[PDB]
Write a structure and sequence with these properties.
CATH architecture of the largest domain in chain A: Orthogonal Bundle
Strand content of chain A: under 5%
Strand order of the largest sheet of chain A: 1-2
CATH topology of the largest domain in chain A: Hydroxylamine Oxidoreductase, Chain A, domain 1
Function (chains A, B, C): Catalyzes the oxidation of hydroxylamine to nitrite. The electrons released in the reaction are partitioned to ammonium monooxygenase and to the respiratory chain. The immediate acceptor of electrons from HAO is cytochrome c-554.
Binding site for hydroxylamine (chains A, B, C): 268
Bound molecules: heme C, protoporphyrin IX containing FE
Number of strands of chain A: 2
Number of helices of chain A: 26
Order of helices and strands of chain A: HHHHEHHHHHEHHHHHHHHHHHHHHHHH
Protein name (chains A, B, C): Hydroxylamine oxidoreductase
Helix content of chain A: 40-55%
Largest sheet of chain A: 2 strands, antiparallel
Binding site for heme c 1 (chains A, B, C): 79, 82-83, 160
Subcellular location (chains A, B, C): Anammoxosome
Oligomer: homotrimer
Radius of gyration of chain A: 26 Å
Structural class of chain A: mainly alpha
């Protein structure tokens, strides 16, 4: 029983909540976690792609092998000493961290805000005892290099060339069970009522599985280009994304900047929308009066925070804060996806809308919160409708074989991808007249502009769904698509006249 | 007599400066303020649009009605207690504010920089006495929820369902007369010599009136989309825009981030230009060594500020700092507007240029300030000329009925909008071949690129008027317009040959 | 002998390292510096352009003349007094600076991190003695207005109208020899093995010479527009760019924001790529825990910095930090330039790659550093190849005289520029069908999108080379170019049929 983890997760793992020991609970999670039938490995399109050099870091459990360069057999203290010279900043950053400073956590004053960590330390120690990693009357001396890079509570020497590993999600989970299980519970909680999306997605628990299952990613020859997508989809394999390497600060992952590198760009510009909104701007202007060290639960009180942030909003469900960020997903970013809009009035959605009001009501009035969320929905449907109008046109042009080069110069897409109209692959692969200008236009209208229109609406950024983003760009796309349709229509007329 | 308010304002209101009491002065302002003949209400196109749920917040004086949900009759202390649970962050933010902490303002040390507030407190108290809101031998205990949300200095109980209101500009004005009048004086000060713009615009005093008077806004069916424009045009109705809700910090409104959400984007990117300039970058790098609590008047001395900011530059006229931001407007953002360029050499403009040098000369040499402002002007005329060349072309294409679908598929715009070439409505409404690709191109060249070219020039951002913005994009527009004109010209040739 | 300056520089100047006195060393540098045969003056295209008002500031040694406005003969103390009123912020900013506070530097504690400055003070004093600017038993009282704006260690009165100057690089060099020589050594160190770029470029030592030698800059009539390019190319003439005017803070130039105004935009978005990367985001989140006052050499230790920055990475060579930023340049930003890609596997490049690993290895493992730099290269070649495919097409269209208006409406470029296909001038000059839409497309594909693809790769920003920038935009360009080629191909078919 790890209170914050959903029953559903316990059930799926076949575990009895009030009976499962930490060892058992952990064993189950890792079972499913390292199982290829659940998303582990190279995927279904494995025969089409090969890993590049940096891939041993993006997916360790599949590609990482120890660096045979230095033939060294070292101990706990050797790792630090040698690396003081070899990787200077890596040793310093670690030493200045809680992993290297466990004593502080123990001698914490009860009236200190960061006191909750002392409890978290006890918990960890009990997880390790249950797993036989720690003796019953033994404390965790520290969390050093040898612990994460070879074995937890490793005493004896480690062979550098045959023992070094890269810490994956489950490695942290040996101690951070509560966090690991909460994230893994996403596979169980994000399940759509009509299969609009794959069970347990979109999420952080299956983001790498989602990346390797993207046909284009597996078929395109430009592995270096394609790899830039892998970097935004590593959360599943390693836990150093929000709270970065060696320092692993929780205060850092609470700041909006932590999500920014991944949650930005054309098909979703969460970072840009948020930073431009009042919430976001106030977060910039008041970041200095806020105590980011205080956990999310006490942020709006002891933390002094008076403006929402990415984590505050997305990691909160019904007053509880967890590592599972799926529980409130209604639009899953892309409004054009089948059965999404259609599902927006389901009791399923209604119940999640209620959860979102519960989040806005910590500050605003419910009447106010409901007034805006309603606009968010109807506004997304207005941008959606515009896309469908333009799409209706270009789609028939396809049905009629009238797209430029459709009959002549439209080379087939790379295997295992099959030909079609308006496919994602067209956003990353082009050859001759595949895709055709008008096709790419109607495509980017939905995948980029319509997507950004929603993001702007969801993140209270006026110009983000009006002039600057969304409507403005979409208005242009529709106009140009129209303007092209008519030109082609007049060209064909003259064509027939001649023949 | 409120020293900072222009004579013109007194005259227009029919008030004798050295005779008008605060009560009288206030009564006049609100008269014009709530008068539909001056911009209040739904406007001239009221029969075409209806307010949406969130509209009761954007325009309270027209749409707001108390939330009948909770049937409660409360007192001053009840508002706070109940809301401690109901709207947690709203109560905390207020308690931590000067409105909730009036005593501090009174016990202020004379040598303290924030001492001027003590005087501002006395003034307010006198405004209230004159209006019978405060007794002659009585102090303002505090500015709590019941004061702003029902009645100023309200003693007895308030009926939640029938008494609650949303504080509009005039509500703050009951106490903050000096600020209210300074902003309202914009109606009187921003008057152009040749009607290039509507009297009292562009400004914050008539920004909502300007929004509802935008035909497209009133005619377009997408009310949710259209509402994102209302959010950038609320300054007229409420004063919580620069210094946000419940905390109402003056230090906050002095920081560039406060203007950012509205003053950014395609048709004007003041935020982006500024942040990228040296002034702006230095403002980011030195924001921590600056005391933002110090009023604008003492910023460059006691505040330690050594780089200009949005407020420092725009709220300063001739050494004085006011809430009226119109007094120095020469180009009103859009250089293509009729008689603007043409007016750039008028004694009117000359005199405002002198006012701007007076602002730059607090730091730079006049010779230096004049060297750049001159470049700003000639540079804007060079971008303007480029637009006019491309415009000359597409305009004739219109005169000759040769725009794509002009004769056939060019549906009429929504009422009360009338058909035409290159209308603003084309930036927010499209149907078939209205507008036509080339039309939208020549349109966005002026409304977006040319506009941004100027903004870049005015806010010392090199790449903002050269490569990245302005010239670069405009060079492309001209090229593509040209390239299309010739193609259509050759297509018609072959047309005639066949018939 | 100034240890940090390359032998090559000594050799080129004809100086004997262990014999050249500071006076001699300085005399040599300035010789070449003020010599038109090396980049000084108006350049080879001088007869085509004239300086505008603000040009006296961008290139003082060529255009600046004292302001005859005020007829004043002043002394050291007069400059300050009068300017206290005339240029308020200019006097304050200076007074609060080290130039105005030399005593502090002298009484510095040895255990203080900013102690190294005391040594730098001694050095300067010795430079001045050697140049007869300072007496043997004399200290530098201070660095005030009269020193920089008339003469170093000036005693007597200065005539405002005939004596005032604008401090150029060599002016600072009278005291800051070490810094001046390090920057000038760029002319000697950035020399490519196959003339891919002009000797000593790209760099800061010859950035103005590079600007005036840009044909378009000299030929285009829009001097105000063209001047926005001069502002990003002033480093050669003045040293107030990274560490700005009057305060001249070294802590300021160490912060990423200092490079941002110039190193951003379409043809290179270093600022945007960096700020979005983990390195950059961590730099934003941890800028407050870092001591920017500590010199680069001690940043990663005493400074507490645990994330790289623009200066840390670019000013470091082999453990040493200098003002010369050329020593590690492999791709010089634009991958499409002839013989660049081709040179990427030369021992020259290999040796610079090794230098870059030496920089990444202060934190990451070499295996890790090498894994990413490899991806950076192969990834840039994949974006390059895509450009070449599209280019191959449009180029033949040129060879065949089939570009829109190529035979008819393609006006010649302004002198001294000669006609051609895909020239830089086409990015800043357009007339009729010159350039042609397809030409501008293939052009911006390389100069903007391909360039940004690389920058994204070099600055670890995933979306910067995938969706948002690079690949995404380039995929569109290729598609649209293709889509146009086919349309023109079918149009000509029907053409022949008619005739
Ligand atoms: C970081 C800047 C990203 C890059 C580069 C790529 N993706 Fe992406 N992707 C990103 C985010 C933040 C999200 C979530 C968006 C949301 O709000 O839902 C996504 C989403 C996807 C998904 C969809 C969900 C699912 O099917 O499970 C997939 C399949 C996906 N991304 C794959 C993918 C591929 C293969 C890319 C390059 C070829 C690509 N993404 C780039 C952020 C980033
Ligand atoms: C916030 C990001 C905005 C959105 C969304 C919209 N507008 Fe706007 N508008 C904005 C600013 C900051 C300004 C001032 C620009 C300047 O420098 O002058 C404007 C200006 C206008 C005006 C012009 C002045 C006048 O006629 O009085 C009008 C009429 C106006 N804006 C209306 C309007 C409408 C109706 C919009 C959507 C359909 C729209 N704006 C969006 C900022 C923002
Ligand atoms: C600041 C925002 C710039 C503006 C405006 C212009 N240029 Fe530029 N340019 C800029 C940078 C940061 C760089 C270096 C890019 C890199 O990573 O290498 C450049 C480079 C050039 C060069 C190339 C190198 C050389 O030939 O020596 C030249 C010739 C150059 N820039 C000239 C130039 C001209 C004339 C411009 C306007 C007409 C232009 N640049 C604008 C930044 C900026
Ligand atoms: C796996 C690479 C891993 C991650 C990720 C991780 C994260 C993490 C965070 C964010 C903190 C907070 C630090 C702060 O002060 O803000 C933290 C703290 C503790 N960790 Fe950890 N940690 C990772 C791995 C491990 C492993 C393998 C162990 C067990 C040997 C472990 C233990 C602890 C303990 C104990 C603490 C301190 C108490 C607490 O703050 O919870 N971590 N870790
Ligand atoms: C920062 C603390 C942060 C937040 C907040 C956040 C949110 C978020 C949500 C709400 C989702 C759910 C999917 C949906 O749209 O319904 C989600 C999904 C993905 N995220 Fe995320 N995310 C934050 C941080 C991070 C970081 C640091 C990265 C990049 C390494 C990242 C990436 C992604 C990706 C990719 C998805 C994948 C969805 C899928 O394909 O199944 N997130 N995130
Ligand atoms: C990977 C499954 C993973 C682990 C494990 C992990 C651990 C971890 C710990 C131990 C803490 C507690 C530290 C403390 O003392 O407060 C913690 C806190 C936060 N994390 Fe985490 N975390 C993992 C992954 C991720 C990812 C991918 C994100 C970003 C979407 C993320 C974010 C956060 C945040 C926010 C906190 C603070 C939460 C709070 O209630 O204050 N973590 N993490
Ligand atoms: C209307 C919603 C309203 C606004 C807006 C507003 C703003 C405002 C600011 C910016 C301050 C400064 C706070 C700081 O410390 O920086 C401030 C201060 C005072 N106010 Fe106020 N205020 C609004 C409404 C009202 C009303 C209705 C009253 C009168 C009952 C009132 C009074 C005061 C007083 C007094 C002060 C303190 C002294 C001062 O700083 O001027 N406010 N307010
Ligand atoms: C931040 C303190 C801030 C500044 C500075 C500022 C300036 C500004 C100017 C100079 C104008 C005058 C119009 C002109 O271009 O000549 C103006 C006009 C508008 N503003 Fe503004 N503004 C600042 C803040 C705010 C905020 C917070 C918003 C958004 C709610 C905002 C909005 C607008 C709008 C809209 C106009 C309207 C002009 C009209 O239509 O008549 N401003 N602003
Ligand atoms: C709406 C008409 C409105 C009112 C009323 C108002 C009040 C207000 C007060 C009382 C202050 C003084 C607080 C103090 O103690 O210093 C004050 C100060 C500033 N305001 Fe304001 N304000 C109103 C509206 C707006 C708007 C729309 C803006 C942004 C364009 C704005 C900005 C500012 C700024 C800046 C300050 C500080 C000015 C200074 O001289 O320091 N206000 N406001
Ligand atoms: C030329 C306009 C010029 C520049 C540029 C410049 C820069 C510079 C910096 C960045 C500092 C550091 C200040 C800090 O505390 O971070 C600095 C310091 C000193 N300078 Fe200087 N300086 C310029 C010009 C001159 C001239 C003409 C002299 C000689 C009369 C001079 C001297 C000094 C001295 C001495 C110091 C203090 C010691 C040190 O930090 O090196 N400077 N300057
Ligand atoms: C900030 C400390 C900063 C850094 C870092 C930086 C880097 C940089 C490099 C690596 C080059 C070399 C050229 C190449 O790409 O190989 C370079 C060149 C130029 N820079 Fe720079 N630069 C920084 C700061 C500044 C500043 C503040 C400006 C703008 C006034 C600026 C400008 C330029 C320009 C222009 C070039 C010219 C190259 C040429 O044409 O020869 N840099 N910079
Ligand atoms: C122009 C040739 C120029 C001079 C001269 C100059 C001087 C200068 C000094 C005296 C210092 C030392 C100050 C101290 O006490 O630490 C110094 C330091 C830095 N500078 Fe510089 N500088 C000149 C030009 C430039 C330019 C164009 C840049 C930006 C690319 C730049 C940057 C820096 C940085 C960074 C530092 C700190 C270096 C460190 O090792 O800490 N300078 N400069």
């Amino acid at each position: 029983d790890i209170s914050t983890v959903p029953d559903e997760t316990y059930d799926a793992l076949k575990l009895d909540r009030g009976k499962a020991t930490p060892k058992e609970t952990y064993e189950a999670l890792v079972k499913r976690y390292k199982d290829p039938a659940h998303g582990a490995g190279k995927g279904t399109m494995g025969d089409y792609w090969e890993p590049i050099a940096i891939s041993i870091y993006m997916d360790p459990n599949t590609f990482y092998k120890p660096p045979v360069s230095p033939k060294e057999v070292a101990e706990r203290k050797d790792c630090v000493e040698c690396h003081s010279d070899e990787t200077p900043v890596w040793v310093r950053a670690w030493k200045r961290s809680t992993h290297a400073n466990l004593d502080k956590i123990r001698n914490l004053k009860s009236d200190d805000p960061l006191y909750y960590k002392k409890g978290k330390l006890e918990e960890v120690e009990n997880n390790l005892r249950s797993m036989g990693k720690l003796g019953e009357k033994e404390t965790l001396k520290e969390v050093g290099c040898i612990d994460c890079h070879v074995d937890v509570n490793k005493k004896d020497k480690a062979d550098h060339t045959k023992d070094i590993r890269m810490p994956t999600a489950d490695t942290c989970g040996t101690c951070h069970l509560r966090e690991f299980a909460e994230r893994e519970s996403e596979r169980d909680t994000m399940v759509w009522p009509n299969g609009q999306w794959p069970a347990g997605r979109p999420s952080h628990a299956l983001d790498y599985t989602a990346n390797i299952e993207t046909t284009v990613w597996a078929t395109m020859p430009q592995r270096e280009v394609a790899e830039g997508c892998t970097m935004c989809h590593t959360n599943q394999n390693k836990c150093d994304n929000c709270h970065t390497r060696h320092e692993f600060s929780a205060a850092e992952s609470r700041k909006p900047e932590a999500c920014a590198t991944c949650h930005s760009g054309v098909d979703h510009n969460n970072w840009e929308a948020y930073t431009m909104s009042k919430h976001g701007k106030l977060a910039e202007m008041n970041r200095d009066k806020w105590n980011w060290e205080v956990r999310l639960k006490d942020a709006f009180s002891k933390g002094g925070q008076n403006a929402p942030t990415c984590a505050a909003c997305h990691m909160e469900y019904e007053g509880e804060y967890t590592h599972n960020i799926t529980r409130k997903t209604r639009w899953a970013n892309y409004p054009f996806v089948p059965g999404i809009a259609e599902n927006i009035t389901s009791d399923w959605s209604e119940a999640r809308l209620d959860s979102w009001v519960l989040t806005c009501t910590q500050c605003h009035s419910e009447r106010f919160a409901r007034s805006y969320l309603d606009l968010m929905d109807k506004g997304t449907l207005e941008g959606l409708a515009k896309y469908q109008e333009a799409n209706a046109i270009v789609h028939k042009m396809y049905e009629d074989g009238t797209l430029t080069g459709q009959k002549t110069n439209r080379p087939n897409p790379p295997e295992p991808e099959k030909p079609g109209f308006g496919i994602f692959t067209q956003l990353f692969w082009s050859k001759g007249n595949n895709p055709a200008s008008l096709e790419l236009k109607v495509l980017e209208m939905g995948e980029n502009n319509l997507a950004k229109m929603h993001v702007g609406l969801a993140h209270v950024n006026p110009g983000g769904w009006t002039y600057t983003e969304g409507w403005g760009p979409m208005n242009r796309a529709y106009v140009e698509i129209q303007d092209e349709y008519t030109k082609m229509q007049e060209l064909s007329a003259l064509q027939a006249r001649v023949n």
